[PDB]
Amino acid sequence: DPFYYDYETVRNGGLIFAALAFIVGLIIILSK
Amino acid sequence: WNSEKKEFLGRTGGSWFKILLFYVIFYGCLAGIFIGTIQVMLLTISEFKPTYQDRVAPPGLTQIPQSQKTEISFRPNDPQSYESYVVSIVRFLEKYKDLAQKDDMIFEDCGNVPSELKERGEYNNERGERKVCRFRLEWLGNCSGLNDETYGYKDGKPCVIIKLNRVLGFKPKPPKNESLETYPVMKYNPYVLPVHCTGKRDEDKEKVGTMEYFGLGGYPGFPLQYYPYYGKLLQPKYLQPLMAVQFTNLTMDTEIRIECKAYGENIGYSEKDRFQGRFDVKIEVKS
Amino acid sequence: KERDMDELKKEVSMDDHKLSLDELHRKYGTDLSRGLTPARAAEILARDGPNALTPPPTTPEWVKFCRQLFGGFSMLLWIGAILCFLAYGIQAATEEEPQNDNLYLGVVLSAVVIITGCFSYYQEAKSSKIMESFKNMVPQQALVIRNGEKMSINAEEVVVGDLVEVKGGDRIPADLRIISANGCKVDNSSLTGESEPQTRSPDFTNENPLETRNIAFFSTNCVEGTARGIVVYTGDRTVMGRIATLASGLEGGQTPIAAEIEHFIHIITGVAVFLGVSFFILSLILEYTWLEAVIFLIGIIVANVPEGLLATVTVCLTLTAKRMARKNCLVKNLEAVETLGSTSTICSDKTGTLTQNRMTVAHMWSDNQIHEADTTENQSGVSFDKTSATWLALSRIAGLCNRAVFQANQENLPILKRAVAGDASESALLKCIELCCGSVKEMRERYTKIVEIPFNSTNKYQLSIHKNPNTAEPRHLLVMKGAPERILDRCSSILIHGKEQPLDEELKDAFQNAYLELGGLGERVLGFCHLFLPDEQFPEGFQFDTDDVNFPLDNLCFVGLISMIDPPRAAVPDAVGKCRSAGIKVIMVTGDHPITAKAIAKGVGIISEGNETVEDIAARLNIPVSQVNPRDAKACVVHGSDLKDMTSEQLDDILKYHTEIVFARTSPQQKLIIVEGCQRQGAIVAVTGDGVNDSPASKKADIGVAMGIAGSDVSKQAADMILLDDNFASIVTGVEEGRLIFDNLKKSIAYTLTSNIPEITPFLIFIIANIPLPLGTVTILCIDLGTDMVPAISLAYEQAESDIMKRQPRNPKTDKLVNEQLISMAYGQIGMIQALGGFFTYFVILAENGFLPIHLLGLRVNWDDRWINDVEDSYGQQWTYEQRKIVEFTCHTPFFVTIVVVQWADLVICKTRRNSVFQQGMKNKILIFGLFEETALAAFLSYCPGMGVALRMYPLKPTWWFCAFPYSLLIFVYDEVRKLIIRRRPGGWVEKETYY
Ligand code: BEF
Ligand SMILES: [Mg+2]
């Protein structure tokens, strides 16, 4: 059915993104 | 006091025409873009298909007198006490008269008994404007079932039509003959979609109501020969089924509550949305 | 009638110091050797007040916190929460969900008002609470004489007109009329800025009773000697008591930034009420009864608010206030932090401020040649050639001949900045010897002092004699110093490279011309001489005596002069070199004398070499000083004597027609009006000082600097800035920063103001095209105050796009912070495209789901209705309520992903005001971090579970993300082709309509 959307997938994926870019920012502000 | 300046309007009127002509050239470009963008995004909307519909998954059971808060409160005496609710039913069914439905080029006379689904090809435009199944005021006995016996509309005893939301394409599946507790309903589970109402939900209930259901050829639900829906553009002046429930033995000067659920695999219920899969009305026939 | 009181305090004080002592004793009724009776003393001590300043009138309450909570901006937010708690009391007529929505919005708006107003009231509070904080005192108990009997009583039981004796070490208990004295020198450095110690005498000497000698002053310690003096003024009637009180009852004035803040909050509320009205009008025009026609007026006046431009402002500053905390420039209040980069004229005191107030070896005379010592605090300069015999002679002379000796714990401290008990000169000398020529510990104990002769009354000399340790000549050694004219009278032999000579009149006038050439230079000069003794006439064991001359007072052997002066702080001069290169005017204000000031001003660069004064041009042409025209003198020395006889326009003419200005012998009161004459030009003024003489002048300067250690306790208590290390080069770093925070701020505002165009136009066209709600308020709350938080913080660590110190200081009336072209950009242009991409985000969603753009006109009506569960789209689908409302909130949330998207393009084109962004680059790390967090946050908020439930934001289908792309793109393109045509066409149109 076109009446069912893999909501749980892009979520678990938008939070990976929210995990990746933030620690790259934890990487950038700590230049040693 | 800077509004007026020696031969110059407000803020440097002298270069007035510059600033403005820039704000006329810029915004009209800002507009000639955005509209390019929107006109693009309208070229991608499929002409006959909505791209996303998942958010209408469990359709819902509505009423004709879309009251203020699902409460029909009126005096069987006062003509105006009920004019609201009734004019609503009058207008609601204004589009439904057999003579409004005359020309046969876009209309088609279907079985007078609940039939199988009327697949008319595919949802595309290859075919021409598809025909709409008709609907005659009869199938609703008493409550708006012809001129005879219903001048008032509920004036005496209350009654109300329940309706299924239109959902494009929905092939409603009724529960199988192995009915997972579907209360009193007759063995016409093959070609219909039933409903049944209750005073309260799942505990002790102020049970006060004798119900009588009017349907096509006399069943309690939704015929299968009208679905699925194919859309306005494909199907204009299409008429979806209506179904009526009437409350006869009702306490007048008391208010009770009524829940009307609809059953099947293709239907769901939501705790946060009481109008998804079921239906609710309070009533009070005060006099 | 206390304004008449505050006007008798800006006036230079007056007195009655010049009487016969019999007349003193007749007007006050007291004995000059017996004082008065403790009956008459317990009579006057309760007649006016204990000899005590009133405590600071300011001991303020805390309910003035309300003002921050209010203003003009926080009101709109108070009518915001009020009228969402109202809408919700209205939402009680049924069973409603705002158990997690509109109740929570009034408290959210209640909290910005309250958390915002806790932050600013703590910012301006530091000015009230911590800018009047300078305390650490030892109460000194006075030596009073009463009914004959010397009795020491506490400082406060003292009264007016009784006898007091002081000695060396005692603080002056109040303001006295010296009736008797003996060798008494006192230190009035703190009250008048007088450098070296001034002697004191009963005799009436000057008239300006300040520089007179028959009067002492409160808070001045008596340096040496002992004296007797009658009490004239007690408590707050003192001179210094008039000065703290004039320091405390003046206005700080407003810092160059908060004025914009208020005039900013004005424009936001006036376009908010402008909109709230003409649309309040149109919503009662259409249909909405008085009930949701007012709820919208909340929906908008409240949505127009940059809810978190206030935290982006507050950190935009903290980070400037931090970078300045890195450059040894501390601010009590965060908004004096920009004051310096905008200053045009700096006022500075000489003593304790520019200088260390410590007499030092400047120049020396040996082998008819002049050698400049090293005159810095940290020994970064030029040491003379120290190999010839003249110096080794001249050196042991000064080093043996002194009463000066080091103190116990002076070993690790710099040899200069360490404490010395002894005269100023005997300090300066002792110092430059222990410095240039090794240690004087084993050098003053090597020689045995037989008899010495301290400073005399007649002539000028100090001498001593010692044995010969040398193995060549066992002859006795004799040494002495004295003034250059009275020693030249008693001297003849000369010394060169180890061999003697006599006085020829040729070199006697090259000496009379290197004494008036080193002494017109402001330095103080002393002649050093020695003589062997005829060891045949005086044997190796004869202990001479002091009744008679025991050795030749003539035919002596002169060695060399040695010059000294109160020298400047090491970092001073370069620091001044900087302030001028930046075009700052620099003016010198000192209570010191016009010759030591003139020397000190010529040597620090306030007065460039070769500028001539009204007096230097008049003595060079041997003409009366009245002849010269005052236009040809670029500089000018203005005695404070003409400075009491002057008006506003004359001064106005001095400051206008003279570049290098120096004021001398100007009372503390006179330093204030100086700051007030430099402020009748409209320029900015930064006042930097040492003692209490700069209290009123640091008080009414736009920003006052104190000295951290050499600073007294009342001109520190007014200064709006502190130089703890007393490093004066710290001011050089401060002009650079107040001029950088200025420019990086202009970027921080323009970031959040552009947002306020794709925040409002939703709530706008909504009532217009009567479409469903495109942008919720929960959403405007996370743009102003949620995600942009950290982007608009990172934008103020931005750097200098060019050479900051190259351009001149800004012009307050012209160069504005928020000007009408910054506006023309953020609201006029950039935010418009921001609206156009978010709106385009809006139409793509509702159209792809079923509602064509052309069909949503006149829809919001049936749309915002909770009981129309059958609403037909352009595909004929019947939508319940929570279903179609679900599609709004997921048209609220993507409009918010689209904004962060454009707030990328806008965070990168605001990062540079003039330069292309491939020229300034992305070297900023925090800003990188700011894009990654402002995006990870936003992606966390949509897809986080139960986000639709608490906040009513749902997760995004992916195809949505990329609807702000060419919009964030085109935006980057526009402002970049703008920041290149203004790089190629400076001359008008392109640069003039836009540049903010
Ligand atoms: F302290 Be300054 F020399 F007036
Ligand atoms: Mg001073």
Residue numbers in the entry:
A (entry chain G): 17 to 48
B (entry chain B): 17 to 303
C (entry chain A): 21 to 1016
Sentences from the paper on this structure:
The Na+,K+-ATPase generates electrochemical gradients of Na+ and K+ across the plasma membrane via a functional cycle that includes various phosphoenzyme intermediates. Furthermore, regulatory FXYD proteins may associate with the complex in a tissue-dependent manner. The ion exchange is driven by ATP hydrolysis via enzyme autophosphorylation and dephosphorylation, and a minimal scheme of the Na+,K+-ATPase cycle, also termed the Post-Albers scheme, includes two major conformations, E1 and E2, in their phosphorylated and nonphosphorylated states.
Indeed, the datasets for Rb+-soaked E2–BeFx (here referred to as quick soak and long soak corresponding to 10 mM, 20 s and 50 mM, 3 h, respectively) produced strong anomalous difference peaks (5.8–8.4 σ) at the cation-binding sites, reflecting exchange of Mg2+ with Rb+. Quantitative determination of Rb+ occupancy was challenging because of the low resolution of the datasets, but occupancy analyses through molecular replacement with single-wavelength anomalous diffraction refinement (MR-SAD, see Experimental procedures section) appeared consistent with two fully occupied binding sites for both protomers in the long Rb+ soak (occupancy > 0.75). In the early (Rb2)E2–BeFx form, αM4 is further tilted ∼5°, and the extracellular gate is closing. Through van der Waals contacts between αM1, αM2, and αM4, the αM1–M2 segment follows αM4 to an intermediate position via a ∼2 Å translation toward the extracellular side. In the next step, reaching the late (Rb2)E2–BeFx form, the αM1–M2 helices are further translated toward to extracellular side (∼4.5 Å) and ∼6° lateral tilted toward the cytosolic side. The cytoplasmic part of the αM2 helix bends toward the A-αM3 linker region. The change of path is likely realized by a partial unwinding of the αM2 helix (M2 switch), which also gains flexibility; as is indicated by poor density for the cytoplasmic end of αM2. The unwinding enables the A domain to rotate ∼7 ° around the phosphorylation site of the P domain (toward the membrane).
